[PDB]
Amino acid sequence: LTAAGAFSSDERAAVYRAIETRRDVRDEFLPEPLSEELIARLLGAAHQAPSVGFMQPWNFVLVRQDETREKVWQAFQRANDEAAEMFSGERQAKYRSLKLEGIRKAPLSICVTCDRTRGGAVVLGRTHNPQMDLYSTVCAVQNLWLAARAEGVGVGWVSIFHESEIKAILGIPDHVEIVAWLCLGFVDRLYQEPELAAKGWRQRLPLEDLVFEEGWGVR
Amino acid sequence: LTAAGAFSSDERAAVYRAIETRRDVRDEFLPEPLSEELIARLLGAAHQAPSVGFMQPWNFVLVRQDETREKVWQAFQRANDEAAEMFSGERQAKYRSLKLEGIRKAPLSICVTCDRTRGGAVVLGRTHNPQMDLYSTVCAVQNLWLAARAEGVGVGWVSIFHESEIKAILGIPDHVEIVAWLCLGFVDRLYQEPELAAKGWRQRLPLEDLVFEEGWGVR
Ligand SMILES: Cc1cc2c(cc1C)N(C[C@H](O)[C@H](O)[C@H](O)COP(=O)(O)O)c1[nH]c(=O)[nH]c(=O)c1N2
Ligand SMILES: Cc1cc2c(cc1C)N(C[C@H](O)[C@H](O)[C@H](O)COP(=O)(O)O)c1[nH]c(=O)[nH]c(=O)c1N2
Numbered sequence: 172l173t174a175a176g177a178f179s180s181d182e183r184a185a186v187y188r189a190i191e192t193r194r195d196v197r198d199e200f201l202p203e204p205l206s207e208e209l210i211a212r213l214l215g216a217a218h219q220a221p222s223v224g225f226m227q228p229w230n231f232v233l234v235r236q237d238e239t240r241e242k243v244w245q246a247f248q249r250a251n252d253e254a255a256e257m258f259s260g261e262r263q264a265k266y267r268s269l270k271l272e273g274i275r276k277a278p279l280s281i282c283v284t285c286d287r288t289r290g291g292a293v294v295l296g297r298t299h300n301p302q303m304d305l306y307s308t309v310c311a312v313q314n315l316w317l318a319a320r321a322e323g324v325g326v327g328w329v330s331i332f333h334e335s336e337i338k339a340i341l342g343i344p345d346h347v348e349i350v351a352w353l354c355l356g357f358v359d360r361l362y363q364e365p366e367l368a369a370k371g372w373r374q375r376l377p378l379e380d381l382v383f384e385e386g387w388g389v390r
Numbered sequence: 391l392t393a394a395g396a397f398s399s400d401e402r403a404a405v406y407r408a409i410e411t412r413r414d415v416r417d418e419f420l421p422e423p424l425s426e427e428l429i430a431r432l433l434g435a436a437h438q439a440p441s442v443g444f445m446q447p448w449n450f451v452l453v454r455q456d457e458t459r460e461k462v463w464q465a466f467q468r469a470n471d472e473a474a475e476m477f478s479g480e481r482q483a484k485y486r487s488l489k490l491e492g493i494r495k496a497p498l499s500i501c502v503t504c505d506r507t508r509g510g511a512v513v514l515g516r517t518h519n520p521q522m523d524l525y526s527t528v529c530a531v532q533n534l535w536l537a538a539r540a541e542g543v544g545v546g547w548v549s550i551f552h553e554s555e556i557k558a559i560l561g562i563p564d565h566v567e568i569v570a571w572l573c574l575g576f577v578d579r580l581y582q583e584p585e586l587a588a589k590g591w592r593q594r595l596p597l598e599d600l601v602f603e604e605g606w607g608v609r
Contacts, residue, residue, distance in 0.1 A: 172579040177542025185404035186540040218597045225586045227595045232602040257512040296549040298473040309525045313532035321405040323396025342606045361394040367444040378437045383451045387561045
């Protein structure tokens with residue numbers, strides 16, 4: 172141990188800045204590839220996330236080739252067609268008009284998975300609450316996302332697709348689970364608020380009535 | 391949109407410092423209570439996390455009272471011993487020596503929840519996994535975890551308990567689910583590396599072993 176620790180005003184501002192400015196990026200990806208050194212720093216961030224029992228259940232399968240990004244994209248559509256069919260009248264139109272991935276456009280894609288049996292037979296956290304290993308994995312992702320914003324790299328989480336297909340296309344064991352598919356690529360333009368809000372799909376909720384005092388539903 | 395690019399060297403360094411020094415703090419929480427202005431910032435960070443279909447499924451229940459922390463600490467006890475009994479040998483006595491919560495010590499606790507039904511009948515980005523909603527909530531948590539470090543606020547995740555027992559305490563309805571119970575409080579010091587690694591319970595896996603290329607198992 173050592174060092175108390177409030178950051179300086181400048182450091183504090185930067186952290187907040189990464190937090191207040193990252194976005195899910197679908198259509199503004201740049202073709203320029205990321206250096207091996209950059210990717211390492213982004214995965215290095217991810218790897219420094221907390222994880223239940225410190226089992227560090229994650230794996231990152233990097234995807235860089237056209238054949239693969241084509242099969243996955245095909246896997247997206249199909250899934251997205253089904254999704255669309257869940258909305259009627261007006262909404263559907265809107266849904267079917269949104270951009271929900273840039274699988275093809277983005278140079279690098281990362282498939283972050285969770286090994287449901289990493290470590291031993293028992294473990295902390297993951298005792299009566301199995302989800303924790305997965306939750307640990309999502310933290311990994313959030314970290315990547317922020318470090319990415321910092322690096323001027325765009326990131327997009329795509330979740331519209333049958334896991335089995337993606338697992339098959341990547342040859343992932345069934346004892347292993349996909350937490351997230353991430354599209355990555357530099358970006359020079361960013362929405363100043365959630366795109367999904369801008370395109371009028373859903374607004375930002377007022378935090379003030381999402382916060383309770385000492386007991387559920389108590390303001 | 392709006393023009394955008396990488397952070398400056400200085401800023402970039404700040405972001406990585408939060409990602410690099412935050413710890414699950416258990417036993418070194420300080421007594422002073424977080425000012426209201428501070429809390430709003432942390433909650434603001436979490437609220438600026440992404441969320442499938444921009445559904446924003448979270449709710450935060452602030453727990454500042456002793457009777458509440460007492461009860462929860464107890465729920466923790468029950469579950470933790472039960473957990474303990476899943477080990478044997480030095481490993482059990484080992485476990486039984488790890489401080490795995492600061493419920494009674496941290497001046498503030500936050501129960502981060504996930505409304506499983508918010509976002510209408512059928513939300514965007516979901517169906518090809520109904521847990522993306524929970525996942526989203528985690529991102530909120532991780533953002534809170536990171537901002538807090540910059541705020542010089544230690545945070546620890548406590549998952550060791552039977553959810554229903556915690557839901558009863560705070561009266562959390564059925565459609566909502568607990569994703570995390572976070573103990574917050576100012577710290578005066580941090581472990582330079584993960585504490586479980588310091589206590590020889592488990593080490594940092596070598597990141598190179600986890601990174602694959604194009605397909606599972608391929609290095
Ligand atoms: C777990 C999870 C999964 C997804 C998302 C998010 C999260 C948290 N998001 C991005 C989502 O739509 C986005 O967070 C909101 O629209 C607001 O984004 P930003 O505030 O700009 O990050 C998303 N976006 C998209 O275009 N296709 C997808 O399949 C998903 N899936
Ligand atoms: C989803 C999830 C859930 C838990 C944790 C983490 C995560 C990601 N951790 C914290 C964990 O023990 C910690 O990550 C490791 O000790 C090392 O990571 P740090 O870098 O120190 O945070 C944790 N710690 C603890 O004392 N009791 C608990 O119930 C849990 N549960």
